[PDB]
Enzyme design. Structure first.
Site, PDB file in Angstrom:
ATOM      1  N   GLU B  37      12.426   9.267   1.153  1.00 54.94           N
ATOM      2  CA  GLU B  37      11.140   9.695   0.630  1.00 54.94           C
ATOM      3  C   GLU B  37      10.502  10.696   1.594  1.00 54.94           C
ATOM      4  O   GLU B  37      10.959  10.855   2.728  1.00 54.94           O
ATOM      5  CB  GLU B  37      10.236   8.467   0.476  1.00 54.94           C
ATOM      6  CG  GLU B  37      10.647   7.519  -0.641  1.00 54.94           C
ATOM      7  CD  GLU B  37       9.638   6.453  -1.050  1.00 54.94           C
ATOM      8  OE1 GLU B  37       8.706   6.188  -0.272  1.00 54.94           O
ATOM      9  OE2 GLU B  37       9.792   5.883  -2.147  1.00 54.94           O
ATOM     10  N   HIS B  46      10.935   9.529   5.314  1.00 55.66           N
ATOM     11  CA  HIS B  46      11.155   8.094   5.620  1.00 55.66           C
ATOM     12  C   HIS B  46      12.070   7.366   4.638  1.00 55.66           C
ATOM     13  O   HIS B  46      12.222   7.830   3.517  1.00 55.66           O
ATOM     14  CB  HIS B  46       9.809   7.356   5.714  1.00 55.66           C
ATOM     15  CG  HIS B  46       9.090   7.132   4.432  1.00 55.66           C
ATOM     16  ND1 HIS B  46       8.345   8.118   3.826  1.00 55.66           N
ATOM     17  CD2 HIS B  46       8.956   6.029   3.668  1.00 55.66           C
ATOM     18  CE1 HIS B  46       7.795   7.640   2.734  1.00 55.66           C
ATOM     19  NE2 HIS B  46       8.156   6.362   2.616  1.00 55.66           N
ATOM     20  N   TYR B  85      10.153   0.561  -7.054  1.00 55.58           N
ATOM     21  CA  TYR B  85       9.390   1.105  -5.954  1.00 55.58           C
ATOM     22  C   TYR B  85      10.289   1.933  -5.036  1.00 55.58           C
ATOM     23  O   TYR B  85       9.929   3.063  -4.663  1.00 55.58           O
ATOM     24  CB  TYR B  85       8.702  -0.025  -5.186  1.00 55.58           C
ATOM     25  CG  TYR B  85       7.704   0.474  -4.180  1.00 55.58           C
ATOM     26  CD1 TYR B  85       6.485   1.003  -4.593  1.00 55.58           C
ATOM     27  CD2 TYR B  85       7.985   0.451  -2.817  1.00 55.58           C
ATOM     28  CE1 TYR B  85       5.547   1.443  -3.673  1.00 55.58           C
ATOM     29  CE2 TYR B  85       7.056   0.887  -1.876  1.00 55.58           C
ATOM     30  CZ  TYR B  85       5.840   1.397  -2.317  1.00 55.58           C
ATOM     31  OH  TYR B  85       4.891   1.862  -1.447  1.00 55.58           O
ATOM     32  N   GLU B  89      11.162   8.242  -5.970  1.00 58.04           N
ATOM     33  CA  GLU B  89      11.347   9.652  -5.626  1.00 58.04           C
ATOM     34  C   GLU B  89      12.769  10.146  -5.911  1.00 58.04           C
ATOM     35  O   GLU B  89      13.093  11.261  -5.507  1.00 58.04           O
ATOM     36  CB  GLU B  89      10.936   9.971  -4.177  1.00 58.04           C
ATOM     37  CG  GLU B  89       9.614   9.336  -3.763  1.00 58.04           C
ATOM     38  CD  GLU B  89       8.836   9.897  -2.571  1.00 58.04           C
ATOM     39  OE1 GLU B  89       9.282  10.890  -1.929  1.00 58.04           O
ATOM     40  OE2 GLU B  89       7.752   9.329  -2.300  1.00 58.04           O
TER      41      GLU B  89
END
Lengths: 154, 154
Positions: B37, B46, B85, B89
């Protein structure tokens, strides 16, 4: 104390007792195998079974699921050894799930980068838990599917 | 206390830290998903990860497997919510395993007798964990295998 792993025997099962066990929702079990034994006129006809439940069950809960006349004990040994024991007379009433594999003496790579996204069989094996992967890597029906894929993409 | 289910963040991963996490043996996990991400120039790059280990692990053991630099905390929410979650991305470092469904809901039959031994796909789903079955019944690659079998046997 509750546990997930139980063995059982039921002597002289009725039609309805067989149907009860065969109708247990397959969502209850990581693995479940019930063999039918003693068809020969020398011996006692009986179910020989092994249940590895998803979650821990009390003795009483197990009696309710399998039936009040079942003789029920905490299972000893590996899921695999219990599979072999309950299948040795070649007549399964029910078999659902996949044995839990505690000591993973697999032939199967543990490296993510060995599972190629161009290999559907390999991706099926990647996309399930260690116990299911190890069992499915030897599964006859996944082997059929592999053979059809190879035929068309060959 | 030890737990199966952990989430983690690693800020500014090196090449080597990424390779460490991607080289973790896939036998460790019921499910494991790590996403990359913070690509866009405003923020911190990260790893965002979720691990459901086969057996319970202490905090220290989790640090051993992942980075020492990783921020690690016990997981809250379902495996599914953690999957969404960690994949939001669209750039996975690693995913191996299948989320654990706590019964939740399936639309998939719980009756053994609805799984036909003439159906290899159905037999693959029968021969696996309740959580692996639910996940594989929607798996893209098992769907390719279904399509090749239907081609040949239709």
């Amino acid at each position: 104390q509750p546990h997930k792993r139980w063995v059982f025997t039921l002597n002289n099962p009725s039609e309805d007792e067989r149907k009860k066990i065969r109708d247990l929702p397959i969502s209850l079990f990581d693995y479940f195998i019930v063999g039918e034994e003693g068809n020969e006129e020398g011996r006692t006809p009986h179910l020989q079974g092994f249940a590895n439940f998803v979650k821990k069950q009390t003795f009483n809960k197990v009696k309710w699921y399998l039936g009040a006349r079942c003789h029920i004990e905490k299972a000893k040994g590996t899921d695999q050894q219990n599979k072999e024991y309950c299948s040795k007379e070649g007549n399964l009433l029910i078999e659902c799930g996949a044995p839990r594999s505690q000591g993973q003496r697999s032939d199967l790579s543990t490296a993510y980068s060995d599972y190629q996204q161009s290999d559907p069989v390999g991706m099926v094996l990647l996309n399930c838990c260690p116990s299911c992967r190890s069992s499915l890597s030897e599964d006859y029906f996944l082997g059929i599917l592999e053979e059809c894929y190879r035929t068309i993409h060959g």
